Structures are given as C-alpha cells and as structure tokens.
Amino acid sequence: ESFLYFAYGSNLLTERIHLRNPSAAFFCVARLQDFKLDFGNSQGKTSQTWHGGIATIFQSPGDEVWGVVWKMNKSNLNSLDEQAGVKSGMYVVIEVKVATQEGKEITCRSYLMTNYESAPPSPQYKKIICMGAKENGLPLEYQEKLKAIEPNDYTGKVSEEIEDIIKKG
Amino acid sequence: EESFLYFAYGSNLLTERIHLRNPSAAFFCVARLQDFKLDFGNSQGKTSQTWHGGIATIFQSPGDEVWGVVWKMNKSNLNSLDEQAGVKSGMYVVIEVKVATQEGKEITCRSYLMTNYESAPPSPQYKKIICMGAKENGLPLEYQEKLKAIEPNDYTGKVSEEIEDIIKK
C-alpha cells in the first residue's frame, strides 16, 4: 500500500511537496550514484511555473545526485505522475536504486526528462531547491554545489505560494 | 504478484532472442506506446560490441508512436533483466510505461531507455533481428514498414555465432 519517491528538485522542500501531496512522509536522505543533475526545458518549453530550466537527471559515471526519499500511499501514484507531467511528455517515470548514508540500498520511483534543451534555473526555483536541501540535511558538500548553480536572469515573479515560502525563508 | 509485464521494442521483439537469457518469458500481447519515438544509439558514447551499431532506445515525442511486444515474466527475473539492460553501467535506466493494446486496453509495463547517448544507426544484423521479431509477433504492418525503412550502418564483419545462426534461418 506504499511506495518510495526520490525527489531531487523542488520536492526537496517539505512545504513544497506537501502542497499537492500533504500525506508525503520523510523517509531518508539518499545518494543516486552515477547520475548528474541538470536543468532544462522539456520539449523545448519553458516552465510557466518556474520561468527557467527545471530539474532533471541523466546517467553519467562518476557523478552523483543527492535527494530526499518520501514515503507515499499507492493511491497517490496517478496524482504524482500528473504533477510530473507524464501524459504531456514532460517527464518519464523511472525506478532507481539509491543509497542511504549507512549504505542501505533503497528502491524508489522517480522522474527524468527524455527530450529537453538544457537551460539555467530561475532564482526562485534554485532557492526552493536550496531551502529543501538545507532543511533535510543533505550533505554540506552537495548544498554548496546547489548554491553555485548559475541561474538565468529572470527578475519577475512566480506564484504567491512559492514567493511567500522564500520570504519566510 | 509473482509476475510483471515488460515492454520490448528492440531485439527482444524476437522470441528466440529474449528466450536466450530469459527462457521463461511468455508472450502477453502487442501494444502501442504513444508519444514516444524510436531511436538508435551508442550509450555513453560506446558502440555495442555485441551488435556493432547503435542499439534501440526511446524518447518522449508528441505525435509519434512506438509499437512493441509485452512479455509476461516471473518477478524473480527482475534483477536478471536489469542486468541484461546494463542498468548498473548506466546504459539504460528502468522506466514505467503505459501501453495500449490494439483493442485499446492500457497496460502498465517495465521497460528501459538510454539517458545519455549519441545517435548512431543500427548494424544490419541488429535491424534484421528487430524486423524478425516485429514480423514473428504480429506488430502492425505499417509499423513493420517503418522498421524495414531504417537505414543501417555499414558493418559487414562477424557478430556472434548465436546471432548469425538466428538470422541465417
């Protein structure tokens, strides 16, 4: 009746995931070996929520991606796929094996883009990701990596819920 | 439940091929994957030394379709099948897809695609295996025409005795 979800993007932040998934429960922090983080425009299309490149991952030996594993009820599978834009070709559903800091291997559902053009994230998107990583105690080494991501030059506004989250941050 | 369904779109379209490492695989049905495009390539820039040409992959592309065979397999074969796809070497990633049978029924299947590759044409031998499986397993004749239309590379050397034998007959 449950599944595990590996979040590496804006769903790193508790308040963000709980927006559409209030019953999501923190499971653990984990590392996905031999994948690299990237930001981009699915189908060449710019996120009208984020106004910049959005998070994705691809296989790349020697690289790693840290994220948060969330536990979720199986009844939320369709909703979570909807959120990720599966039917509209935005992300594909994946299965990955991630490692906890104690070396336990965890099988999780996640998402990645299959057809995108690489593009820098907006300041607000980067900030939510930065806040999530910090909140959930991802390695300091990884946190600084996220801090050093070059954002695009968007100086406009995102949704009030998101903007309010950053203000409280 | 004991079993899972696996969607094959490459060399595992051929019964004799999939049976060589997965002898207990059973034909379930033919199905269509909507809004995906078939491609061939060198995963992580490496050319397959089994096939000596680009190997099969898929990516999200509105408008396009990929037809394939759904195989029913015991859940004890999961790790083996992941092993065959080179998941651990970063060749393919495990995906979940929803496919439609010719009668319009949606099926949830395990499959694979490449996340980091260079586009390169298949070897004549690879194309033959795929064409054979497509034909043997009753994929629509228009899709068979698409497959027959694939431009192969120029490889005319030796592939394994097991593969050459299958094509021969």
Side-chain angles (χ1 to χ4, degrees):
Chain A
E1 35 65 49
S2 287
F3 71 102
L4 298 181
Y5 163 56
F6 180 73
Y8 56 84
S10 56
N11 284 335
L12 285 179
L13 182 56
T14 295
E15 204 167 11
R16 173 65 182 185
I17 197 166
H18 280 160
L19 281 165
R20 297 279 321 279
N21 315 275
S23 68
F26 182 86
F27 193 69
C28 70
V29 163
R31 179 180 40 83
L32 179 56
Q33 200 45 46
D34 307 315
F35 275 75
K36 179 173 199 181
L37 179 68
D38 201 4
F39 297 82
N41 298 335
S42 143
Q43 312 287 338
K45 284 174 151 191
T46 304
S47 174
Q48 298 302 325
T49 308
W50 296 108
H51 297 116
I54 51 164
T56 191
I57 56 169
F58 63 88
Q59 295 154 310
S60 170
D63 282 295
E64 68 190 33
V65 169
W66 288 83
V68 174
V69 173
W70 297 96
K71 189 176 194 200
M72 308 206 58
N73 313 314
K74 265 168 190 182
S75 59
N76 304 124
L77 275 163
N78 283 330
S79 169
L80 191 67
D81 288 0
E82 197 272 348
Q83 286 159 50
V86 173
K87 302 265 175 190
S88 55
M90 198 171 306
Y91 287 78
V92 75
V93 172
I94 65 173
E95 179 181 284
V96 288
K97 288 178 199 317
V98 299
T100 73
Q101 289 206 168
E102 281 73 16
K104 293 167 271 78
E105 189 174 76
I106 307 303
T107 301
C108 309
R109 180 184 199 81
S110 189
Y111 303 89
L112 59 70
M113 302 188 286
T114 61
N115 196 349
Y116 75 98
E117 320 193 319
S118 183
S122 66
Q124 300 91 335
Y125 192 53
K126 182 189 164 176
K127 177 72 166 149
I128 295 298
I129 289 165
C130 278
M131 290 166 68
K134 181 181 170 199
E135 176 185 69
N136 291 299
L138 272 60
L140 255 276
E141 295 68 38
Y142 194 77
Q143 295 197 32
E144 167 62 40
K145 262 189 142 200
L146 305 167
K147 289 189 75 168
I149 295 153
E150 186 53 30
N152 67 16
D153 65 311
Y154 184 64
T155 51
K157 286 172 195 203
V158 294
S159 85
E160 173 197 308
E161 342 160 274
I162 302 167
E163 286 289 1
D164 274 8
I165 284 157
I166 296 166
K167 282 191 192 190
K168 307 169 213 159
Chain B
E1 59 124 6
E2 178 75 17
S3 300
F4 68 101
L5 299 172
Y6 154 66
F7 181 71
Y9 54 80
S11 55
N12 290 345
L13 290 174
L14 188 67
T15 307
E16 283 161 319
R17 172 68 183 177
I18 194 174
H19 279 168
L20 82 53
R21 281 292 299 286
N22 318 280
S24 68
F27 177 79
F28 190 75
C29 64
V30 172
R32 176 181 169 165
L33 185 46
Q34 239 278 289
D35 304 314
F36 273 79
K37 189 165 171 57
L38 185 71
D39 198 17
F40 299 86
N42 299 325
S43 181
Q44 308 296 341
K46 302 165 185 126
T47 306
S48 164
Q49 293 300 288
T50 302
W51 295 110
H52 295 279
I55 55 172
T57 190
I58 60 188
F59 65 91
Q60 293 154 305
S61 170
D64 288 344
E65 66 187 20
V66 173
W67 285 85
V69 169
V70 180
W71 294 103
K72 192 184 203 188
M73 278 163 87
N74 203 300
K75 263 177 167 169
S76 68
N77 295 171
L78 221 26
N79 282 351
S80 188
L81 194 67
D82 287 2
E83 257 270 304
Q84 295 165 53
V87 169
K88 282 182 196 164
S89 32
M91 196 176 299
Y92 289 80
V93 74
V94 170
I95 58 173
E96 188 194 281
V97 283
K98 296 167 175 210
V99 291
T101 66
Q102 289 175 51
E103 75 275 352
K105 192 198 189 214
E106 85 131 63
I107 331 179
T108 295
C109 298
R110 186 185 197 83
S111 200
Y112 306 85
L113 60 76
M114 306 189 264
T115 62
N116 194 18
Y117 76 97
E118 289 147 10
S119 215
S123 55
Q125 292 89 355
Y126 192 56
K127 174 173 162 185
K128 297 193 184 72
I129 291 296
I130 286 175
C131 276
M132 281 175 69
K135 185 152 177 281
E136 170 195 66
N137 285 316
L139 257 54
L141 297 165
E142 189 41 50
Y143 194 73
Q144 283 182 53
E145 292 306 308
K146 276 190 84 157
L147 296 176
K148 284 189 103 162
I150 290 157
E151 304 174 75
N153 70 14
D154 60 343
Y155 183 90
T156 64
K158 171 167 198 164
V159 299
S160 65
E161 275 187 302
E162 57 203 351
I163 292 159
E164 288 301 345
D165 270 338
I166 286 172
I167 292 167
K168 274 207 205 75
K169 50 179 61 69

